[PDB]
């Protein structure tokens, strides 16, 4: 818990550029069967010493085009979770989760992860 | 049909180089969510003049 307290103070306070923990998200184009699909590498980095012990998890959420359409959409959003296990200093792990065309180039674009 | 028979004869023939229609495969490791996957790209190439019009698969 003390490691968690130090980490939480690090993230929330110190209103500077470099935080100890970060998650940079890129986009990429990869080929599956014949299609091209978009991918999001979300790369989590631990630049500090605090070493996220256990009972930390990583909750990515991928929100489509944002508006209050009357009927609803079949998938308002998607969520993925991953338990982070050790993640000591300087380490990093990487998660490719797609955004790709929904069934007929079906990709409205602002899309926020 | 004539174009088909010509492609067929070229493909069945021996020339010491697979000219008319070739298909290479090549392995590439990719990434899906957490686990690395092994994919095979199969590139089909037409070198010769013969057009594979509708009817081939």
């Amino acid at each position: 818990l003390n490691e968690a307290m130090n980490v939480s103070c690090a993230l929330l306070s110190s209103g500077t550029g470099p935080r100890p923990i970060s998650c940079t998200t890129s986009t990429t184009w990869s080929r599956l069967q014949t299609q091209d699909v978009l991918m999001a590498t979300c790369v989590l980095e631990n630049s500090s010493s605090f070493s996220l012990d256990q009972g930390w998890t990583l909750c990515i959420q991928v929100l489509t085009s944002s508006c209050a359409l009357d009927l609803d959409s079949a998938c308002s959003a998607i969520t993925y979770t991953i338990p982070v296990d050790q993640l000591g200093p300087g380490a990093r792990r990487e998660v490719t989760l797609p955004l790709g065309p929904g069934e007929n180039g079906g990709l409205d674009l602002p899309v926020t992860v």
Side-chain angles (χ1 to χ4, degrees), chain A:
Chain A
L1 195 152
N2 191 1
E3 305 195 22
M5 301 216 67
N6 283 37
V7 159
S8 186
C9 300
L11 300 176
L12 283 147
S13 201
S14 63
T16 78
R19 292 170 148 200
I21 314 284
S22 56
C23 190
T24 47
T25 102
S26 78
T27 56
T28 314
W29 283 101
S30 86
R31 213 178 182 75
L32 261 290
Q33 298 214 141
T34 57
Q35 291 84 246
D36 287 320
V37 305
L38 257 173
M39 304 302 266
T41 63
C42 292
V43 189
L44 195 155
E45 292 154 28
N46 175 26
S47 48
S48 63
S49 52
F50 291 114
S51 190
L52 317 189
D53 310 82
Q54 186 159 29
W56 286 94
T57 187
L58 181 60
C59 326
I60 293 148
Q61 34 169 359
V62 173
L63 281 144
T64 63
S65 76
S66 297
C67 175
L69 291 174
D70 53 319
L71 295 156
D72 266 303
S73 189
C75 207
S76 82
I78 286 177
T79 42
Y80 309 88
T81 79
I82 326 160
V84 172
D85 47 11
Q86 280 149 9
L87 197 61
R92 52 184 263 159
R93 53 203 73 174
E94 157 168 341
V95 193
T96 50
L97 59 96
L99 319 165
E103 309 101 28
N104 53 290
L107 184 42
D108 316 298
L109 273 187
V111 70
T112 177
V113 332

